[PDB]
UniProtKB/Swiss-Prot annotation, chains A, B:
This protein's UniProt keywords: Carbohydrate metabolism, Hydrolase, Magnesium, Manganese, Metal-binding
Gene3D superfamilies: 3.40.190.80, Fructose-1,6-Bisphosphatase, subunit A, domain 1 (3.30.540.10)
Reaction equations catalysed: beta-D-fructose 1,6-bisphosphate + H2O = beta-D-fructose 6-phosphate + phosphate; a myo-inositol phosphate + H2O = myo-inositol + phosphate
Residues given in the record as Mg(2+) 2 binding sites: 82, 85, 200
Designated name of the protein: Fructose-1,6-bisphosphatase/inositol-1-monophosphatase
UniProt source species: Archaeoglobus fulgidus (strain ATCC 49558 / DSM 4304 / JCM 9628 / NBRC 100126 / VC-16)
Required cofactor(s): Mg(2+); Mn(2+)
Entry EC number(s): 3.1.3.11, 3.1.3.25
Origin organism lineage: Archaea, Methanobacteriati, Methanobacteriota, Archaeoglobi, Archaeoglobales
Control of this protein's activity: Both FBPase and IMPase activities are inhibited by Ca(2+). In contrast to mammalian I-1-P phosphatases, is only very weakly inhibited by Li(+) (with an IC(50) of about 290 mM).
Length: 252, 252
């Protein structure tokens, strides 16, 4: 499998999930269908999303790691799947939630070759490959502002911070693409409970990187060895190469 | 002018303001075009919307306290209008921004008789009149949440908090409606500099209170004497009656 193949499968997935959720009225979406592989309720809308995805997906030679259903298959391309990040927002009709996909030639983030984040609410498509990061077919890169007086996404502000704006939309993959686009100058999930999972962060991280962003663990450690088919925890510090050290200092 | 008048007015403007915005490129939107009378830059998205609304409100016997051109007219019916609330989103394509209209029978908030917040991205319509509060013509009401461990929207988390979640979507007018319909447990703006202005909060407050919420200033004192002028600013604490006293001791 290559990137184009990856781009082709993701768009196919994007359309199906898009359709399944779009149909489901809020009061259906909100219902607990079961206990997720993640340890949190699997709501009716996450069930349809993950279903749609997994039907296109498992016709591939992939080992998939998905939010609700765990580790699936044994193929040697790993897919970090988030069938619907922003669940809370979709169950109440707030237009920020996506399907996020990250393909790797190993069970390690450092071998990622393709990243994909589709805005299920607005139909906004992001992805990055060996040619660059994109939004709705147009190239994108991170902003170049290096003052901490900036536009930050942040989970969570523990204290008084210097930011210009602080925002929390509730969708780690999409917010990372909000960082990738330059819409926001940084992204931070610095909660001492390292709560992010590999599939919520996988592609946005990848994509954040092709658009120029520097992205690391809390202490600036590399995200290269974060694993898939293991239950990985992530904290993220993501900014251009310039603001990046200052943030690192800022929370230290 | 009647509660039934105010809604038809509000509806004209939302549709005109929605066409106007939807047809501007993000490129053309984020462009500064002047100093608003509120002390911030007017962006092109801001005046396009404002001109389109004002174009209609000018037919009515009112005084408008509007963000970009300030207070225009001498009618007896007062209208607070944020032409565009969430401009930063709007100029990013983040789909959370609205037109806000609050109509009062006088200068003060206590005389409000109608509230209207319309999401210009989604089409969602939030209004309230004597008949209560609505979301797209469906009766709404706030959360029943009695627990401080809840889903909060707050500006700005500066300390270690016990909410089950925290969110900040960038449009308080809109976010006041997410609490109004019970999509969130509480809205809090507690920024010490008291940032909010009347057109930010008046319609969201009126909608939420009609939805059964207790909405007050930072102390717990009512907002009834908040002024429909440009100098007015405020802090906000929003929750159901049981929860509301709780956040007051919390934020103490
Ligand atoms: O992961 P937490 O603890 O919910 O923090 C918020 C994040 O949760 C995620 O759903 C990840 O599971 C993100 O979409 C959201 O932005
Ligand atoms: O940009 P800030 O400082 O985060 O303030 C956010 C506020 O912006 C407003 O548009 C008012 O300026 C509100 O809708 C939102 O609640
Ligand atoms: Mn889950
Ligand atoms: Mn999810
Ligand atoms: Mn997720
Ligand atoms: Mn302004
Ligand atoms: Mn505005
Ligand atoms: Mn505003």
């Amino acid at each position: 499998m290559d990137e184009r193949d990856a781009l082709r499968i993701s768009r196919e997935i994007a359309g199906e999930v898009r359709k399944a959720i779009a149909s489901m009225p809020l009061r259906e979406r909100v219902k607990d269908v079961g206990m997720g592989k993640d340890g949190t309720p699997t709501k009716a809308a996450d069930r349809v999303a993950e279903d749609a995805a997994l039907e296109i997906l498992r016709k591939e030679r992939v080992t998939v790691v998905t939010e609700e259903s765990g580790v699936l298959g044994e193929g040697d391309v790993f897919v970090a799947l988030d069938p619907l990040d922003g669940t809370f927002n979709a169950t109440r009709g707030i237009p920020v939630y996506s399907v996020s996909l990250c393909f790797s030639y190993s069970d390690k983030l450092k071998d990622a070759f393709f990243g994909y984040v589709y805005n299920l609410a607005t139909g906004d498509e992001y992805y990055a490959d060996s040619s660059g990061a994109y939004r709705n077919g147009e190239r994108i890169e991170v902003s170049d502002a290096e003052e901490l007086y900036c536009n930050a996404i942040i989970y969570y502000p523990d204290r008084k911070f210097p930011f210009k704006r602080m925002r929390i939309f509730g969708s780690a993959a999409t917010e990372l693409c909000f960082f990738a686009d330059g819409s926001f100058d940084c992204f931070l999930d610095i909660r001492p409970g390292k709560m992010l999972r590999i599939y919520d962060a996988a592609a946005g991280v990848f994509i954040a990187e092709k658009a120029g962003g520097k992205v690391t663990e809390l202490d600036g450690e590399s995200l290269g060895n974060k694993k898939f088919d293991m239950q990985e925890r992530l904290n993220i510090v993501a900014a251009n190469e310039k603001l990046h050290p200052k943030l690192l200092e800022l929370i230290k």
